[PDB]
C-alpha cells in the first residue's frame, strides 16, 4: 500500500526462492502483461541467478512508454529501459486507490532534466530548472521552475488519465548457480510396476520397491558395484526405495 512515485521508483531484489509465476499470468487482474524475449509459461520452466523488481505509478497513457525502444516524459526523465531488455512488464489499473477527489498530489513525477536517463539510471534531484535565459541556479521565479510535477489523479477523468501501477522485472546472467526457479511437479509414487521416473534429476526406468537399506541422512541415492543406480530416496516422505530393471 506504499507504491513508489515514479520519479523515485523503488527496486526489489529477489533471490533464493521458488518463483511461482503461474498465478501471475493466470490472474486476470493484470490489465497488461509483456515479456521481451521471454514467454510467460517458460518463466516457471526457467531459472535465474538473481532477479529485480521495480514499481512506480503512472497513468494509462504513460503505461505505453514502459518498453524498450520507447521514449517520453516517464521513459526518459523518470525510468528508462535498455533496448536489449530481457525482462517482462506487468501493469494494472489502480484508479480508485490512487485517484483523489482533488487530485493525488502525494505522488510526483519529473518534468525536467538536463539530459535523458541512461538505462536504469535513477535521479531524484530537485534543482530548480532553467527554463529560459536566466541562470536560475536554484532560485524560483520567472522561467525558473520546480523540476518535479505532482500527479493530478482526479476521479473525474477518462481511462487514459486514470492512474496505473506498474511492475517491471528482469533476471541476471548465468555467472553463478541459479537461485530462483518455478515450482516442480510432485506426482504420486508407484510400486511393483515398470515405470519411467525422474526423482530429482536421476532419470531411469525400472520397477520400484521399498527395501531394508539404511541410507545416511545426507545420502540421496544408492549405487551398485558396477556403478549402476541401485536405490533412491523419495524426497517427499524420505523413505528408501529400491530399483530393479524392468523384465
Amino acid at each position, epitope marked *: 500500500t506504499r507504491f513508489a512515485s515514479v520519479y523515485a521508483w523503488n527496486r526489489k531484489r529477489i533471490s533464493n526462492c521458488v518463483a511461482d509465476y503461474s498465478v501471475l499470468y493466470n490472474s486476470a487482474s493484470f490489465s497488461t502483461f509483456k515479456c521481451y524475449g521471454v514467454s510467460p509459461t517458460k518463466l516457471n520452466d526457467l531459472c535465474f541467478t538473481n532477479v529485480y523488481a521495480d514499481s512506480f505509478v503512472i497513468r494509462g497513457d504513460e503505461v505505453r512508454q514502459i518498453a524498450p525502444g520507447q521514449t517520453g516524459k516517464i521513459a526518459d526523465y523518470n525510468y528508462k529501459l535498455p533496448d536489449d531488455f530481457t525482462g517482462c512488464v506487468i501493469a494494472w489499473n489502480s484508479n*480508485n*486507490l490512487d485517484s*483523489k477527489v*482533488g487530485g493525488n498530489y502525494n505522488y510526483l513525477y519529473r518534468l525536467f532534466r538536463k539530459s535523458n536517463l541512461k538505462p536504469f539510471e535513477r535521479d531524484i534531484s530537485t534543482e530548480i530548472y532553467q527554463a529560459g535565459s536566466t541562470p536560475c541556479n536554484g532560485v524560483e521565479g520567472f522561467n525558473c521552475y520546480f523540476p518535479l510535477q505532482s500527479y493530478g489523479f482526479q*476521479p*473525474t477523468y477518462g481511462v487514459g488519465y486514470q492512474p496505473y501501477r506498474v511492475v517491471v522485472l528482469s533476471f541476471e546472467l548465468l555467472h553463478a548457480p541459479a537461485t530462483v526457479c518455478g515450482p516442480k511437479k510432485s506426482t504420486n509414487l508407484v510400486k511393483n510396476k515398470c515405470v519411467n521416473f525422474n526423482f530429482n534429476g536421476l532419470t531411469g526406468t525400472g520397477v520400484l520397491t521399498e527395501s531394508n537399506k539404511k541410507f545416511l541422512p545426507f545420502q540421496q541415492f544408492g549405487r551398485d558395484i558396477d556403478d549402476t543406480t541401485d536405490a533412491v530416496r523419495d524426497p517427499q516422505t524420505l523413505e528408501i526405495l529400491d530399483i530393479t530393471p524392468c523384465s
Partner: antibody
Amino acid sequence: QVQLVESGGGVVQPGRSLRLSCAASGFTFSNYAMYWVRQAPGKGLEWVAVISYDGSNKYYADSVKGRFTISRDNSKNTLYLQMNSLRTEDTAVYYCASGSDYGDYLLVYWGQGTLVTVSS
Amino acid sequence: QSALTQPASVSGSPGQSITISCTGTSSDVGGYNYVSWYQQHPGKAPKLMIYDVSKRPSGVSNRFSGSKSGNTASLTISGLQSEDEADYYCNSLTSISTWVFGGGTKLTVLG
C-alpha cells in the same frame, strides 16, 4: 472497524452561526477525503460539500455553498463544518463520511450522526 | 437537492430477485462508472454496500449485483429476505466534482 462520531449538534436562532464536527478513529484520517451528509425525518439523504485529503481543495453544492464552510484537522483525525445563514428547514440530522481503500470518492464509513435545531 | 431519479417502490416474495434503477443527466451518471448504493434501517444511519456500480465491499452479502446502461445504473438484489426491507438510495459523482444522492426507492420483501 473504522468509526466516525459526529458532535456539535446545537440549538440556535436562524442566521446565527453554528458549528458541526466529527472525529475519526481506527484509520489514517489524513489519507482520505471527508464528506458531510444530512437527513430530515422521514426523508432521504442529502449531500454536503467535500474537503480533500490535505484540505487544499474543496467543492460545494449551491444549497450549502457560501452558507457553510468545511475544514479538517489531520493531527486530531477530526472534521469540522462552520455554518451560517441557517433556516428552519435546516433542522436535520447530519452525518459525515470518508473515502477508504475502496475509493477516495466513496462515502464508505458513516457515524451515528447528530441533530441540529433551528427556530425563532 | 438535485437528486437522482429512482423508481418509487417494488415488492416481491422471499427468495425472489428485484432490480432498482438509478438515473440522472449524462454528467451525473453517464460520465463515469462510480455509481454507488446505500441502505438504511430503522433508527440507524445509512450504510453503503456498492462501489463502481458492481463491486461488493467487505461485510456485504453476495446477493448484490449492479450494471450500467446509458444514463442509468441499476442494483439487483437476489435472494430477497426480510432484512432487505428498507429505503434504498443511489449516489453518483458529477463532472462538477460534486456528489448527488438519489430520491430513494422502497423495497418490500413479503415475509
